Amino acid sequence: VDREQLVQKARLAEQAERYDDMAAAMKNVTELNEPLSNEERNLLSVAYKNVVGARRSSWRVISSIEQKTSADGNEKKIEMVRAYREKIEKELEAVCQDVLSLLDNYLIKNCSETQYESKVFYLKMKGDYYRYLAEVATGEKRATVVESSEKAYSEAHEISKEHMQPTHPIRLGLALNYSVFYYEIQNAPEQACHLAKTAFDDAIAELDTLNEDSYKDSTLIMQLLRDNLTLWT
Amino acid sequence: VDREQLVQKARLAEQAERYDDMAAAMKNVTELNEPLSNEERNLLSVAYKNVVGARRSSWRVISSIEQKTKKIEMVRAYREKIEKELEAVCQDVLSLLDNYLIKNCSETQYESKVFYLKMKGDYYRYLAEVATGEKRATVVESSEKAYSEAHEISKEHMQPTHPIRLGLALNYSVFYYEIQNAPEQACHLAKTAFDDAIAELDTLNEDSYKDSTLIMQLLRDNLTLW
Amino acid sequence: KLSLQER
Amino acid sequence: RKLSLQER
Numbered sequence: 001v002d003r004e005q006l007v008q009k010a011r012l013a014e015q016a017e018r019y020d021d022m023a024a025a026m027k028n029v030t031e032l033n034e035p036l037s038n039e040e041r042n043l044l045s046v047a048y049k050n051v052v053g054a055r056r057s058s059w060r061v062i063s064s065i066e067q068k069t070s071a072d073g074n075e076k077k078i079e080m081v082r083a084y085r086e087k088i089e090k091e092l093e094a095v096c097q098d099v100l101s102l103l104d105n106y107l108i109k110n111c112s113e114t115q116y117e118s119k120v121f122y123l124k125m126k127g128d129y130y131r132y133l134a135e136v137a138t139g140e141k142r143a144t145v146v147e148s149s150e151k152a153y154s155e156a157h158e159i160s161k162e163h164m165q166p167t168h169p170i171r172l173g174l175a176l177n178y179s180v181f182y183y184e185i186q187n188a189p190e191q192a193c194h195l196a197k198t199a200f201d202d203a204i205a206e207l208d209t210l211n212e213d214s215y216k217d218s219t220l221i222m223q224l225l226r227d228n229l230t231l232w233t
Numbered sequence: 234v235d236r237e238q239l240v241q242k243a244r245l246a247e248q249a250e251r252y253d254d255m256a257a258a259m260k261n262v263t264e265l266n267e268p269l270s271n272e273e274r275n276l277l278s279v280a281y282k283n284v285v286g287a288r289r290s291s292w293r294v295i296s297s298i299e300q301k302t303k304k305i306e307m308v309r310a311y312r313e314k315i316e317k318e319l320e321a322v323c324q325d326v327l328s329l330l331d332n333y334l335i336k337n338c339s340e341t342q343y344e345s346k347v348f349y350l351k352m353k354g355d356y357y358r359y360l361a362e363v364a365t366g367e368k369r370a371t372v373v374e375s376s377e378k379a380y381s382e383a384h385e386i387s388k389e390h391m392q393p394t395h396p397i398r399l400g401l402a403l404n405y406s407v408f409y410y411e412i413q414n415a416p417e418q419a420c421h422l423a424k425t426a427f428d429d430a431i432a433e434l435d436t437l438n439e440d441s442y443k444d445s446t447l448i449m450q451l452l453r454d455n456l457t458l459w
Numbered sequence: 460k461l462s463l464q465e466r
Numbered sequence: 467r468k469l470s471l472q473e474r
């Protein structure tokens with residue numbers, strides 16, 4: 001039940017597609033107050049993303065049912081859909097607050113000044129899981145967590161711009177989700193198009209710097225950046 | 234708290250892929266002691282099939298990793314943890330069969346009795362996949378009696394081209410192959426049910442003909458694989 | 460599997 | 467589809 005065994009369990013849960021156990025195993029490894037390896041860092045992020053992704057997918061389906069049958073006939077059935085939707089939000093908000101707690105207590109705190117890659121990695125997770133909370137929010141509760149995601153992306157944007165190559169996967173992934181936060185959340189298409197094209201052109205300027213070790217990860221995000229830029233114009 | 238909304242909740246859980254909630258809603262509908270309709274019976278079946286199916290896939294992946302490979306003791310622990318969940322889901326649906334579903338089936342509801350006896354044999358066969366020692370022979374004899382009783386009822390009071398009768402023969406052949414390890418008994422029932430279905434294949438039931446031909450394709454694909 | 464896989 | 471980077 002040591003650190004090596006918990007990572008082995010998280011590897012098994014990913015093979016068994018039991019992402020709930022995978023996120024629970026990597027949560028305990030995070031709670032060991034030790035730095036996370038690049039493999040352990042990716043397994044922790046993949047686990048919670050699939051867990052929160054399952055609740056987001058279920059929420060979009062049920063919320064679409066409410067938008068369709070707003071006041072169509074039976075009102076008691078809408079009460080069942082509303083309580084089912086609010087139960088999904090309670091599970092989604094609990095998973096997000098679980099990730100945001102591990103970041104600001106075990107991951108961001110343990111990051112040194114020289115660990116720029118791990119700092120931008122965890123800062124984008126804070127911006128992502130706060131954006132997911134902004135997806136489920138109304139009134140002041142939305143803008144309260146939107147600014148929490150605005151400060152998480154903008155801070156990582158200033159850090160990853162200086163001490164990181166423009167062709168780095170974490171750099172491109174940060175600019176991708178940041179443009180998504182500017183488009184879907186803030187309804188600012190001009191800010192998203194400019195930010196996406198800026199990181200895209202910055203990556204094109206140094207295409208010769210791609211190493212044979214990790215290049216498909218970089219080309220995939222650049223392809224996603226070009227796809228979103230083509231449909232946003 | 235009513236019956237109609239629990240069925241609506243099960244439909245919403247199916248479209249949200251929350252099969253755990255779906256199996257819970259149909260469990261409450263079944264626990265209302267009222268016989269399930271054709272759509273409600275399929276909702277309960279599909280729900281627990283996806284629930285026990287996800288546990289079987291995770292068990293088969295962990296078992297294959299334990300076979301291909303301080304590091305093993307944890308794999309065996311993750312195996313028994315999934316086994317505990319798999320056995321809990323099986324004993325849950327098996328209790329719904331022996332108390333609510335089969336009990337509310339008269340001796341003349343042949344189509345419903347074959348469906349529930351096949352389901353009893355399926356989830357007892359699922360227990361035979363993870364049981365060891367005398368616990369295996371106990372649930373294998375239970376799955377045998379459930380499949381045998383369902384086979385005799387469908388052999389006499391049912392049509393050879395019935396999809397439920399064909400699906401029963403498919404799972405009965407799978408039981409004889411993957412559990413009893415008797416490919417002679419497995420291919421015998423599959424070929425017998427296939428020949429009896431082809432003999433009356435010209436009827437082409439307008440109600441559901443694609444479902445009948447699809448199960449024959451599954452019987453045909455199993456004959457090619459074996 | 461080889462069994463009748465439902466929806 | 468989702469415009470964000472999906473974590474495969």
Ligand SMILES: COC[C@H]1CC[C@H]2[C@@H](C)[C@@H](O)[C@H](O[C@H]3O[C@H](CO)[C@@H](O)[C@H](O)[C@H]3O)[C@H]3[C@H](C(C)C)CC[C@]3(C)C[C@H]12
Nearest residue numbers: 042045046121124125169170173214217220472473474
């Ligand atoms: C919160 O933002 C963090 C993401 C930002 C950048 C990205 C880098 C680290 C990337 O390198 C990772 O990819 C590694 O993990 C895979 C499998 O886990 C390997 O296929 C692969 O080779 C390996 O590089 C990816 C990934 C690629 C694009 C398909 C999806 C998200 C993930 C997991 C994390 C992060």
